Design a protein around this ligand. Structure first.
Ligand SMILES: *[C@H](O)[C@H](C[C@@H]1CCNC1=O)NC(=O)[C@H](CC(C)C)NC(=O)OC[C@@H]1CCC(=O)N1CCC1CCCCC1
Ligand SMILES: *[C@H](O)[C@H](C[C@@H]1CCNC1=O)NC(=O)[C@H](CC(C)C)NC(=O)OC[C@@H]1CCC(=O)N1CCC1CCCCC1
Lengths: 303, 303
């Protein structure tokens, strides 16, 4: 029986209309064009021989407005100002994007999902959705030239930009910047080996997945036994789980199914020791890539 | 280690601009507006009391052009002609869609992937990618009102429309129509219980996934032992696998990794009996939802 759950991304058209190519000397990547501003990773200023130990402050001073080229491929924009904010460049152009959507900037938190528009040379090429891992990486699909690809969520008609792609880590995962210019996690935008924080199971997302299983008639793992939130969170710290924090979205699932959160916290502790040959929604391992919001929307039609 | 593989959909903007709402009496769903034509499922003509045993021929005769309303939400189109082709209606409107992309119509084959734009009331709400299963269903995410949502692939700038959503099966999976009006599989657009053909593992996609594992440095399952294509396909018929048919995309992966296809056919036969506690790209079961094309594009950057 299919759970009715897929990896669902927002329709990407609104963001496609904001994507541009930024070139600086021998370097090129993607930028995001909103109003009179173009955001892009600052290592577009770095020549290939200094990617390991860049001096971005000196690099920025060496630039003029004519050091940058901004092109929209799907118009050439004259750059009239340039500034650096953290790991991003803010270029000012003389044309406001006529397709600028209603938007804000936000930081995404571990366990939360967002949509990514992967672009190359200013051309959108694919879209997918990821969850911010507890170690502030994402399990993405990014190749050379993808930097400046953007991640976002959408509230109503308002796009909430939360990610701009910067780099691939040694374990194949990815990270980038929020639009305040801070890198997610402790990462730096330099091409050197960097310490990787341990990843964890996202407990709230595992709980959501188990509710999705109940909503599909799969509840063999549900017992009257209960583990309290405080008891589970002590257990989580010793077992590579995030501490559980309940939300209204989770409570809706408890109300719909009639299964208490603490019943699923107990089930998680037992299932972590092993599924014993049984499957939950086609899986023999805990799934934490679906949020409570995903389950409410895709299965219950609740937004 | 992350494989670098995600469920990747095409950017949906080109298709969002073609989506409309179609209303017929008390029924409403989505349509696809291309040139002067609007395609939509024919059961928009059915009142709720006849969804089990509809007479679409008599229903169509009872309609006039003014029986239909077509609205674009993200202009109201006057309907000037109506016709039925299989399980779809072809409405003719008096305005050509100014955002009509270059397009064709095609039928997708089992094992092949395509992008879906899920819409409600003519408003796109999400995008995801699915593989046509060997029993001509897809493992989608569709709720009431999603009918007329469209599936497509993209070759260059040309959109290849291949699916229009029609119904949910008893096991939670989904099916719909090609744009020649034929339903995928043996399914009928009536709200009755229908025979479900058995699903199968898509062997060519499993082979692609094992190549992706090798490309990520995971090759413990590779042995000098080989099973021929003809020998495997005899085995497949007795073990719920599709018969393997090689392609140029698969051959590229063999050339890149230096591992022969027949080596992976042997590995599949052994892995089908059990992973013996080991994992491949984070999984303890065979994965068939990634195509050879997905692996070539996402990992090797080859399109
Ligand atoms: C920008 O388009 C680019 C996106 C990358 C390319 C491959 N996949 C991506 O997501 N970003 C970069 O190339 C980064 C530029 C820096 C921040 C100045 N660097 C980066 O992503 O380096 C990836 C390399 C290659 C694999 C790996 O482990 N790794 C990490 C850096 C470091 C290099 C030296 C050896 C230890 C690891
Ligand atoms: C159109 O928007 C709609 C899309 C559906 C709604 C739920 N998810 C979807 O993908 N399509 C329909 O409602 C179909 C209309 C027919 C083709 C005239 N019917 C349909 O999808 O029926 C689904 C029902 C409910 C679950 C189930 O097993 N099933 C199959 C039909 C039949 C009904 C009678 C009892 C046995 C199963």
């Amino acid at each position: 029986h299919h759970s009715g759950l897929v990896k669902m991304s927002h329709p990407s058209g609104d963001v496609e209309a904001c994507m541009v190519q930024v070139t600086c000397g021998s370097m090129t990547l993607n930028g995001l064009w909103l109003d009179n501003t173009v955001w892009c990773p600052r290592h577009v200023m770095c020549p290939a021989d200094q990617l390991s130990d860049p001096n971005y402050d000196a690099l920025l001073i060496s630039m003029t407005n004519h050091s940058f080229s901004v092109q929209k491929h799907i118009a050439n924009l004259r750059v009239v100002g340039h500034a650096m904010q953290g790991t991003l460049l803010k270029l000012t152009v003389d044309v406001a994007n006529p397709s600028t959507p209603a938007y804000t900037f936000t930081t995404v938190k571990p366990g939360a999902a967002f949509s990514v528009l992967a672009c190359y040379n200013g051309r959108p090429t694919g879209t997918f959705t990821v969850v911010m891992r507890p170690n502030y990486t994402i399990k993405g699909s990014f190749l050379c030239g993808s930097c400046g690809s953007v991640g976002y969520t959408k509230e109503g008609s308002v796009i909430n930009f939360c990610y701009m792609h910067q780099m691939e880590l040694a374990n194949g995962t990815h990270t980038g910047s929020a639009f305040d210019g801070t890198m997610y996690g402790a990462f730096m935008d330099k091409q050197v080996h960097q310490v990787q924080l341990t990843d964890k199971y996202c407990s709230v997302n595992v709980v959501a997945w188990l509710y999705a299983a109940i909503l599909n008639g799969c509840a063999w793992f549900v017992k009257p036994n209960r583990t309290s939130v405080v008891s589970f969170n002590e257990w989580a710290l010793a077992n590579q789980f995030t501490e559980f924090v309940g939300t209204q979205s989770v409570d809706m699932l408890a109300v719909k199914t009639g299964v208490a959160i603490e019943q699923l916290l107990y089930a998680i502790q037992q299932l972590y020791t092993g599924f014993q040959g049984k499957q939950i929604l086609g899986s023999t391992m805990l799934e934490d890539e679906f949020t409570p919001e995903d389950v409410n929307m895709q299965i219950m039609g609740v937004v």
